[PDB]
Design brief:
The complex is a heterohexamer, with two copies of chain A (145 residues) and four copies of chain B (149 residues).
Chain A (H helix, E strand, L loop, with lengths): L1 E6 L24 E4 L2 H11 L12 E6 L20 H14 L4 E5 L7 E5 L10 E5 L9
Antiparallel strand pairs in A: 1-3, 2-5, 3-6, 4-5
Chain B lengths: L6 H16 L7 H10 L4 H9 L4 H7 L2 H10 L5 H21 L2 H8 L18 H16 L4
Helix pairs in contact in B: 1-6, 6-7, 6-8
Classes of the chains: A alpha+beta (145), B mainly alpha (149).
InterPro entries (chains A, C): RES_dom (IPR014914)
Pfam family, one (chains A, C): RES
Organism (chains A, C): Pseudomonas putida (Arthrobacter siderocapsulatus)
Chain lengths: 145, 149, 145, 149, 149, 149
């Protein structure tokens, strides 16, 4: 399977979660947020961290994550309407997934687009070493603004 | 700080821009940074930083009023500790944004633009309180790690 | 295959191309621009048509386009660096595809994201009637901003 | 033909918004609309549109200079054909933007924000020429059809 | 401007004729066209148009009165935005009409004769308003759909 | 802050203690906390905190001079943004220490006991600057890690 990450790092350590929290985790744990398509990763960053295209950092790297289709995937419990406005619930669900270390990936719904699935990546899981990563450079024919 | 923001690029870039903004040596420890704030920065730093465009005159007046600032310069007094702290907050957030964004232009524009997370306030406007400064710090760190859902 | 369209319309008529041009066509021919993912359709609109998330029209409809995998597809030639800065190139290639009417779909590369493919859909082609479409509603838990 | 690009429901909303802005009947023919512009709109109108926030003073001055506008009201004169058509340009683009965006608030904000397509000019600032007004019409139609590549 | 088709070519003919009348390059983008209008066309451009027979003496002072025009020539001033806009509108419809009809003489006679769909008004008098220019454009497009009716 | 281990205890205990010291709800967002600070805390809360032993008189004078504090109470004025910010730093660090140590008494003396890496300054005296408060927070986290000093 193919996953995509947009960040300042060409690795999958996710060590920033030890300091900072997200929508699907509370700080104190390594975690990587990823999407199923390059625009999926870009749209989340631009909307949720409020970056205009002219301000898109030169430090960002589009990282292509290659994983075997046989990789372990956890599952979310059913979410009732209004879940996107309940940070305490979404952070708790991700915390338990990461702490239990049951599977490498956890698919989560997108809060912006319907029929769009994002992914949580647990680096502490043993199957994390099976990832093949590659940076896809932004070129004059493939960049915002 | 220097773990989440990695040493190879981030923290050195953060400390290097901080050294250009406030003359704080890169190898100075955290307590030595605190001592420099309590010791009081030179009032001539405020004028130089606005000339460079790091902060606006309206923001410079938030740190210290203009007639107080010119009185500090003429008598050659250092800024008070809280005047120095408010100046450090702006330089601290600026240097971190320039490390995360990589360009001074992109960093300043992002810091000068309203945010729905802050109910229409800009990141620079949230530096009035240290709790608001933390909120800008984490948002900058969320950009570096890609924690945007 | 699954394609996605974001527009004010719950159809695939694309008759607005009779009046207005695009990056891949000159006006005077019906055409539908689609993506391979919901965020792909959204990112193209927000960036190219310069719409802030707060100004996103309430009239926009996310359209799921279901086509059989045997659908006819034309092929672009290999484009060279600087292709995205040449309106003469992209307008002509889409014009020739729409006028020749040899295939229903034309895969085109994205100008803002690497490894991302968009699609031109010609309503004049007979295979256009093989599409099944349905609107995916924007909900409180799946909406811009 | 605007009616065929905007469909039956989009064109009707467009003519409904224009009816509110310029009191042009929904079913009025395009030739009648042209006649109403050459006949001249009341200068009293341009004042009430500024009152309601439909126009800013800057957009109002773009249609007619303030000194000229005050003379029209004091001498009870209809706006000239050139002043009326520039007024029609603003109401025309406002009504179409409201039909495309569906909300008055969303449309006016988009019309007032700088655009990279216009090298930093806002769509409203493009109404100084007929060719610039056409550029805004096209961009609005590209949004409706989803022609963003 | 971008309301053009005619099997891709006809637009090139329009741009080619437009490049003769106002020296506007065919490869110029729309915004570059709009900046040329806002920059202001040379006042001498209008005199040459009549010498080459493109404009009546009277359609020319529809664009700008003569005495002011001579003042601009003598004081070396460009035409204003409103005068440049009116000049572009005349050249735009002339280039369009020349494209559909295929000859300058036949296109100009059609633009100057009264029409029954305009209640005795000529196409040139319809160019005084935005809606009126649209009616002339559509009539020309309908003529093109019938290959010069 | 949210980096305290066991979400079941630490961050929840911190918010619970913080809701005891001030009136900040446990589920209140970060921006809502900043709005409460910028709104200004009631002056009668600083008196009550000292009366209950949460703040020494000397810690209270560091937040606001007592003549000013008596003026705020008498004129029924809320504390200013800077005074509210300084009060929040004390309550925030106190709530954090109580969460880590588990007892109010030990947190109170540890915050008042001098430290050798602060060159004899107490953790409370480090709260005058943004960097100083960060060092106290980190010091508490280091104690929680490798648990038990």
């Amino acid at each position: 399977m193919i996953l995509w990450r947009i960040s300042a790092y060409a690795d999958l350590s996710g060590t920033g979660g030890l300091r900072v929290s997200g929508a699907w985790h509370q700080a104190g744990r390594p975690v990587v947020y990823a999407a199923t398509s390059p625009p999926g990763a870009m749209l989340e960053v631009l909307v949720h961290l409020e970056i205009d295209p002219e301000d898109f950092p030169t430090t960002m790297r589009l990282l292509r994550i290659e994983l075997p289709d046989t990789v372990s995937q956890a599952q979310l419990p059913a979410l009732q309407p209004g879940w996107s406005a309940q940070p305490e619930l979404t952070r708790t669900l991700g915390n338990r997934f990461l702490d239990d270390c049951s599977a490498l990936l956890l698919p989560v719904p997108s809060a912006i687009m319907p029929s769009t699935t994002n992914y949580l990546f647990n680096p502490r899981h043993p199957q994390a070493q099976s990832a093949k990563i590659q940076v896809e450079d932004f070129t004059p024919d493939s960049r915002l603004f | 700080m220097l773990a989440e923001v990695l040493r190879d690029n981030g923290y050195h870039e953060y400390r290097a821009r901080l050294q250009a903004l406030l003359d704080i040596p890169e190898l100075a420890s955290d307590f030595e940074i605190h001592t420099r704030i309590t010791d009081g920065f030179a009032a001539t730093w405020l004028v130089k930083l606005t000339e460079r465009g790091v902060l606006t005159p309206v923001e410079r007046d938030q740190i210290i009023p203009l007639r107080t600032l010119k009185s500090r310069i003429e008598r050659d007094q250092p800024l008070t500790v809280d005047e120095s702290d408010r100046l450090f907050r702006s330089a601290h957030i600026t240097a971190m944004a320039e490390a995360v964004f990589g360009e001074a232009g992109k960093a300043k524009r992002w810091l000068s633009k309203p945010k729905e997370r802050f109910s229409g306030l800009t990141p620079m406007q949230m530096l009035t309180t240290q709790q608001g400064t933390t909120q800008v710090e984490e948002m900058l760190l969320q950009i570096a790690e890609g924690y945007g859902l």
